[PDB]
Structure 1
């Protein structure tokens, strides 16, 4: 049984979100400023600048692309709370009306990536993967967590949407509430 030991501050950030999309009824403002792709490209670029071994950087880029594609394919299935699903559907409608097939990675913020990571242990232990492969995955995502916690106040700052602007979250109207929750 594998275990992933997230730093405490990111657990607090996750619980803070878990309240925000629950009984305060806010949602994630989209398209956010720092999507998933910018995060991971910055991570990989910064880590390849210091790493000298070839296989290290090969496994680095493999991890990057793999996390990317799996987020891309799983976001719709199991990363969204109940209240958000309506915004998701509306985004699909807009994309299909504009004839651009939807990519989750170029709209959604990093908080969903933290949601993914927080899930990841169950995702892996529900499978038949190799012990060494799952172990290297845990070590890898752990290094990603470390690099993320070094910059935690660049993405996850608080701004109180009800007063100034451009906070990471926004409020919903009563019609959006009614449709999304009480369809």
Structure 2
């Protein structure tokens, strides 16, 4: 089982690793675009692009499965140790707000890219049918190329040191102290 990723999103993931571990920059969680609308726009675009031979049912199934998997996988294999305390703040806020918080309303597509990158290590670690494997990897390829065609409007390189919106914020000294402590 092998999966390939176009080089732009690989560079985006490597830049994310550098921002978190080296530059100490967590993602701007109060962002304009989140995972739910990413998959909604993906569904709408590839629905109006092609015909309807019966692939819309498996399209909806794939996007719903991705949404649920991102909801229940976000604090398991994503979420660097620096960002764990940031997850803690908004989980405590939602506990005070008496509401249930799921990842897809506040988390951006970079964590979805992280999940896509780490997908083969659980694809190889579970017992699953080969046809479903090929279908999953194929739909992963269409999602990857669709994100490639919309990489400029969705992953724009901006520095938080001088811009209000950069899908990234600089970490404070106290935040780093609690995170690494």
TM-score (norm 2): 0.97
Q: In structure 1, what is the Cα distance between the partners aligned to 2:117 and 2:163?
A: 31
3-state SS of 2:76 partner? helix
Gaps of 5+ in 1: none
CA deviation after TM superposition for structure 1 residue 125, in Å = 1.1
Count residues with an aligned counterpart.
181
CA deviation after TM superposition for structure 1 residue 164, in Å = 2.5
3-state SS of 1:155 partner? coil
3-state SS of 1:21 partner? helix
CA deviation after TM superposition for structure 1 residue 50, in Å = 2.3
CA deviation after TM superposition for structure 1 residue 94, in Å = 0.1
Aligned residue in 2 for 1:34: 33
Contact 1:28 1:168 in 2 (8 A): yes
Q: In structure 1, what is the Cα distance between the partners aligned to 2:147 and 2:95?
A: 34
CA deviation after TM superposition for structure 1 residue 51, in Å = 2.7
CA-to-partner distance for each residue in 1:63-93, whole Å, 9 max, x for gaps?
0000000000000111011111000011110
CA deviation after TM superposition for structure 1 residue 172, in Å = 1.4
CA-to-partner distance for each residue in 1:8-50, whole Å, 9 max, x for gaps?
1111110000100011111111221110011000000011112
3-state SS of 1:93 partner? helix
CA deviation after TM superposition for structure 1 residue 52, in Å = 2.1
Q: In structure 2, what is the Cα distance between the partners aligned to 1:164 and 1:5?
A: 33
Q: In structure 1, what is the Cα distance between the partners aligned to 2:24 and 2:108?
A: 18
TM-score (norm 1): 0.96
3-state SS of 2:56 partner? helix
Contact 1:75 1:104 in 2 (8 A): yes
RMSD: 0.9
Contact 1:51 1:57 in 2 (8 A): no
Aligned residue in 2 for 1:111: 110
CA deviation after TM superposition for structure 1 residue 57, in Å = 1.0
CA deviation after TM superposition for structure 1 residue 147, in Å = 0.6
Q: In structure 2, what is the Cα distance between the partners aligned to 1:147 and 1:43?
A: 7
3-state SS of 2:169 partner? strand
CA deviation after TM superposition for structure 1 residue 55, in Å = 2.3
Tell me which stretches of 4 or more aligned residues in structure 1 moved more than 6 Å: none
